[PDB]
Design an enzyme around this catalytic site. Structure first.
Site, PDB file in Angstrom:
ATOM      1  N   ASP A  59       0.843  -1.186   0.000  1.00  0.00           N
ATOM      2  CA  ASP A  59       0.000   0.000   0.000  1.00  0.00           C
ATOM      3  C   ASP A  59       0.878   1.236   0.000  1.00  0.00           C
ATOM      4  OD1 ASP A  59      -2.276  -1.614   0.021  1.00  0.00           O
ATOM      5  OD2 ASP A  59      -2.683  -1.413   2.139  1.00  0.00           O
ATOM      6  N   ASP A  65       2.058   7.708   4.514  1.00  0.00           N
ATOM      7  CA  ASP A  65       1.539   8.013   5.869  1.00  0.00           C
ATOM      8  C   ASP A  65       2.451   7.619   7.000  1.00  0.00           C
ATOM      9  OD1 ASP A  65      -0.882   9.153   5.129  1.00  0.00           O
ATOM     10  OD2 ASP A  65      -1.904   7.150   5.104  1.00  0.00           O
ATOM     11  N   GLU A  88      -2.447  12.110  14.501  1.00  0.00           N
ATOM     12  CA  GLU A  88      -3.569  11.511  13.823  1.00  0.00           C
ATOM     13  C   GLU A  88      -3.370  10.006  13.583  1.00  0.00           C
ATOM     14  OE1 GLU A  88      -3.839  10.253  10.515  1.00  0.00           O
ATOM     15  OE2 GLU A  88      -6.033   9.962  10.635  1.00  0.00           O
ATOM     16  N   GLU A  89      -2.126   9.585  13.365  1.00  0.00           N
ATOM     17  CA  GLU A  89      -1.825   8.167  12.965  1.00  0.00           C
ATOM     18  C   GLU A  89      -1.677   7.211  14.126  1.00  0.00           C
ATOM     19  OE1 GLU A  89      -1.453   6.735   9.873  1.00  0.00           O
ATOM     20  OE2 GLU A  89      -2.432   8.647   9.334  1.00  0.00           O
ATOM     21  N   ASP A 109      -1.291  16.324  12.374  1.00  0.00           N
ATOM     22  CA  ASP A 109      -1.777  15.418  11.348  1.00  0.00           C
ATOM     23  C   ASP A 109      -0.658  15.465  10.272  1.00  0.00           C
ATOM     24  OD1 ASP A 109      -2.957  13.873   9.270  1.00  0.00           O
ATOM     25  OD2 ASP A 109      -4.905  14.731   9.658  1.00  0.00           O
ATOM     26  N   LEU A 111       0.032  13.931   7.491  1.00  0.00           N
ATOM     27  CA  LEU A 111      -0.291  13.951   6.064  1.00  0.00           C
ATOM     28  C   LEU A 111      -1.783  13.865   5.854  1.00  0.00           C
ATOM     29  CD1 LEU A 111       1.254  14.314   3.422  1.00  0.00           C
ATOM     30  CD2 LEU A 111       1.059  11.776   3.045  1.00  0.00           C
ATOM     31  N   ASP A 112      -2.426  15.008   5.954  1.00  0.00           N
ATOM     32  CA  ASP A 112      -3.864  15.147   5.872  1.00  0.00           C
ATOM     33  C   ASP A 112      -4.306  15.142   4.435  1.00  0.00           C
ATOM     34  OD1 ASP A 112      -6.092  16.645   7.901  1.00  0.00           O
ATOM     35  OD2 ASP A 112      -6.448  16.851   5.751  1.00  0.00           O
ATOM     36  N   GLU A 270      -6.628  18.956  13.621  1.00  0.00           N
ATOM     37  CA  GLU A 270      -7.177  19.577  12.428  1.00  0.00           C
ATOM     38  C   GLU A 270      -7.852  20.888  12.744  1.00  0.00           C
ATOM     39  OE1 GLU A 270      -9.540  16.107  10.870  1.00  0.00           O
ATOM     40  OE2 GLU A 270      -8.313  16.454   9.070  1.00  0.00           O
TER      41      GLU A 270
END
Ligand SMILES: Nc1ncnc2c1ncn2[C@@H]1O[C@H](COP(=O)(O)O)[C@@H](O)[C@H]1O
Ligand SMILES: Nc1ncnc2c1ncn2[C@@H]1O[C@H](COP(=O)(O)O)[C@@H](O)[C@H]1O
Ligand SMILES: Nc1ncnc2c1ncn2[C@@H]1O[C@H](COP(=O)(O)O)[C@@H](O)[C@H]1O
Ligand SMILES: Nc1ncnc2c1ncn2[C@@H]1O[C@H](COP(=O)(O)O)[C@@H](O)[C@H]1O
Lengths: 326, 326, 321, 321
Positions: A59, A65, A88-89, A109, A111-112, A270
């Site tokens: 992937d 990410d 975020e991850e 975050d 890589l939004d 965010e």
């Protein structure tokens, strides 16, 4: 100033603040991670993945990410300026090793919009920095209201790579010159228009909107004041849409709806950062019932509704809200 | 193939076609201009504009348009493969000097979306190539139906830089590796989904829509078949929206409306090229009354309505059209 | 140690030094100039020069303007001396700080055509005194606060010292940052390479003649030394640092004061080589002890591994009368 | 002439040659390898090696794999000889074409540490015959169809000839394309620089000793020649092309066959220097007339401006008995 580069500008702002250099190092670290992310997002080294030296590993989204997350964590921890990070991850708050512990808490975050990467949509990185005011560091240090932000910003990896940064004295914009490897100041103390002519939301959730959202959108398309309808834009990548709101004016919305009764977008990494930038530029950012920055976080991955932009547009939205709740 | 790079791939396709190399040179030229445009769009050399060597020169949008236009014209003319060029940026067709005249006609938009540049929106370059079939070269050689396209493509300057290209045997996608300076094949013979779950148009013209468009959009949001509403996306930059349609499926529309009774988008160098790519990938592209590629151009800057994407979605739109015209 | 990038490393050293940030800003400015220069030297934008959209002198001028601008706009400087300018450049009063910088913005650029490795060399002094002037740049090398060089070779490298040894950084052009690749580098006590232009053999003094003879024809049964001479000072000096040995541009009959310039070539590289545990001499005096008379003054230069320089000096002393 | 880029230029030459595209594809493949190598040599991605996200041997291996892969996947090759491989590499039958390529993927890489200019060298032959094997790479240099080199110096440059002179191209890293900067370059008839490792003086033959003596101590009242020796073959050969003079690596007592390798160092550069109007000799024979015995065979090499090489050869012939 005459400072030209982000590196000199940030250093000089830290000298004027009489800082010890701890926040300046944290900011240098974040910006370095952002440069490294920009290179990867633009696909430097892609030929090597496709077998140019005889080695094929094809992937990809998940990898980018993980890499972006790994860049930010390692850069921030190695700054010696941090005690707690929320990503975020990652499910849990990441507590900095005692040997490298400093004063600051960072919510980010890395890589939004990475879900969109396959269509080459603009994507970005978002962060908010707090001071640990508080006993031993824990996720609780990340659960501070947005009013407590010391610095916040975003990087937009669009047609060019740009950073918006505020340390509390307005919003400054910097563009990456890839030939030089430095961010260059392009606009100092940016202010959002008082009123715009663009509205930005996913109208595919129209069936699920509250009465307020329905009313507001109908008036953007069918005005009752003799004016031209607003133009619509929605990239679906939060940083792209927020940045366009900042530079062109108007409104951006991701309100609660039937399927997402608490909103979709995440409060810590965010909504708080972008609310701070937008307010620092003279705009408004609301949940619909209070300023985003006044929400008291209960959990590190909490969702909130978000409506932001030009003050006259956000006021017009809040009017629909109050009227339909009455 | 094993060809890996766009340069080798195009050469090899030209060997299989038994070409004399004239089209291969034209394609090399266009792709070189695209690389040069990507560098400029990403802001290489920006520090020099902002006074790094003591010299400050800060309409930036107009400059980048002129430069992008100048790159494409000079590269194409110097290929020795062209006789007539039509550019979005020039009022009249540009006739190649007799000394450098070849066989091919090229219609292009050197930097589509450049109006949006200030918000760092994805932007792109679009082109269609025809054979002069026809006496002395003139704008008439550019007024051929899209059915006559020999090759067409687009470059998207998004989070990465990508090229979609077809020479009549399907659509291939290439990504620019900036560390290498070459486009790398990432997907061969791409096919659009038969049906998507995204609809893409500017709903701010809702007040001006015909009955067909109104009906179709209402059914995307309020389906009558028990399915979930479609998601909405609209970047407002044609290449970004078309490319997302290609990779994710769904529909993209810029129909005629009351204020733009013939559409907005330009037939020769926007709609024909993307219609060709989309059809080559198994999709449909219509004006609403006929295939884009069957429109007989009357003038080099003619506008047309455009609706394109997944065949089942475009069919559902055409159904609304026929029903409401009956 | 953990700092990885030159920007973080320099900042951390300034924090350790309890600096006000003035020198740190100056270093940041110089390093930004160097990145801009590396990009131009590698020929970014060349296609535009050759008419895609329809000179060694130009690159000298650009590199000079890059350095002057970045340094003046740091607010950290009062006086600059450049190889490219006749006179010292006195910083506008509004932008004045306490540092004096002597630099060669693009050393080796006369040989750009053959694509030889070339470089940028600088030394920084604290002004001592009194209104700023040329005299402020006429301090001896012992007074240097910071110095270094950038080599634009197969990769772009910076060597930097602020008084605590020499650190080496390499530019990652994909990131646009210099990465620490070696901390506190030390030159070998004795090397196996000698480096000078033997095309001036006819004009050498007896000491130099004798020394080269010993390198090629050793009397103790050791293997002769290898020879290398790039003709670009930063490439030859850097090779001497990393591999060891000796580099020489002595006085000769045709160049009786020597060729290399004291302020912005010899002092800076001397400072680096001594910080790395080597020696740097005019053949009369350590370079860093020479009291400068004029901003474009020339001097002889012999530097490198200490055991090799001491041998050379023994030859000089021996043939004196 | 109008073509600007190497890709367009090579394509146009193939169209003029009425080629089927096989050689053109091979050249495209080699040039793509060279761009990949330049990027690695300039250290793109170094920050990742130093732990941002948490070796000369590796770069040799990478460069070798880049060239082998790009060449094999061209479908234009049957046999490759690399400096890095003991044995010839025979292309899989499915990917076989008519060309044989001899190359040094990263010449000078043992000295990567000092950041010396380094390069990539190649020569291409048409197979003559019969199942492919090593013997197909043992053609003399006179049979070369195309050859050239890439120099990774202050900028990245390629010198290429396909039999009609030498053309020079420079990489614009901002565009990712080589730009034509000089067409049909001609070496000076006589230069003013000599280039060899005089650290082997103790092991020179009398002819070499005599020649160097004449360069430093001319008897006709002319100025002595300047000396340059980078120790990296492509940098020294390229400087000799653009400035003139002579480059020598002759046999000596310690290296009696010489040091440089015939197939993938000496033949390719000889081909370029002769195409540019210079001479290239072993001191016994023109390099390009040497009939190769083994794929890693060594030979002496003297090349450069024809008037300077002829002088050297006069010294050789004179001291023969
Ligand atoms: N580089 C900077 N830019 C803006 N504000 C700064 C900077 N450095 C420090 N400050 C301010 O000074 C405070 C303390 O700095 P520090 O000693 O670096 O933790 C910060 O929390 C900021 O409010
Ligand atoms: N590189 C190429 N890729 C795909 N088709 C090609 C190529 N080169 C030539 N062709 C086909 O062959 C025709 C004539 O080529 P030309 O002789 O190059 O004008 C073109 O109009 C195409 O239909
Ligand atoms: N970034 C730095 N690295 C090493 N030493 C420094 C640094 N900044 C300052 N110093 C030392 O402290 C002095 C005062 O710094 P400043 O207060 O910036 O003029 C300098 O002259 C240096 O000797
Ligand atoms: N791109 C080119 N540039 C110069 N000469 C070429 C080129 N391509 C082919 N030739 C000449 O024509 C021959 C046949 O080419 P090919 O048909 O590709 O094997 C080659 O061996 C060359 O001598």
């Amino acid at each position: 100033t005459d400072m030209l580069t982000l590196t000199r500008y940030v250093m000089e702002k830290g000298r004027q603040a009489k800082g010890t250099g701890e926040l300046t190092q944290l900011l240098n670290s974040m910006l370095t991670a952002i440069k490294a992310i920009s290179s990867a997002v633009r696909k430097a080294g892609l030929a090597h993945l496709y077998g140019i030296a005889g080695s094929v590993n094809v992937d990809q989204v998940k990898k980018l990410d993980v890499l972006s997350n790994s860049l930010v964590i390692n850069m921030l921890q190695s700054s010696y300026s941090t005690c707690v990070l929320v990503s975020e991850e990652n499910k849990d708050a990441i507590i900095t090793a005692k040997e490298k512990r400093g004063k600051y808490v960072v919510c980010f975050d890395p890589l939004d919009g990475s879900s969109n990467i396959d269509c080459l949509a603009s994507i970005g990185t978002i962060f908010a920095i707090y001071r640990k005011t508080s006993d031993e560091p824990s996720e609780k240090d990340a659960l501070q209201c947005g009013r407590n932000i010391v610095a916040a910003g975003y990087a937009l990896y669009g047609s060019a790579t740009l950073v918006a940064l505020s340390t509390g004295q307005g919003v400054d914009l910097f563009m990456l010159d890839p030939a030089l490897g430095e961010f260059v100041l392009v606009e100092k103390d940016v202010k959002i228009k008082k009123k715009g002519k663009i509205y930005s939301l996913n109208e595919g959730y129209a069936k699920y909107f509250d009465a307020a959202t329905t009313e507001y959108v109908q008036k953007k398309k069918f005005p009752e004041d003799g004016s031209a309808p607003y133009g619509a834009r929605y990239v679906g990548s939060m940083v792209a849409d927020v940045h366009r709101t900042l530079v062109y004016g108007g409104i951006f919305l991701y309100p609660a709806n039937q399927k997402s009764p608490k909103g979709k977008l995440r409060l810590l990494y965010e909504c708080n950062p972008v609310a701070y930038i937008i307010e620092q530029a003279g705009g408004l950012a609301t949940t619909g019932t209070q300023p985003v920055l006044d929400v008291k976080p209960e959990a590190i991955h909490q969702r909130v509704p978000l409506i932001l932009g030009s003050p006259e547009d956000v006021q017009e939205y809040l009017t629909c809200v109050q009227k339909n709740q009455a």
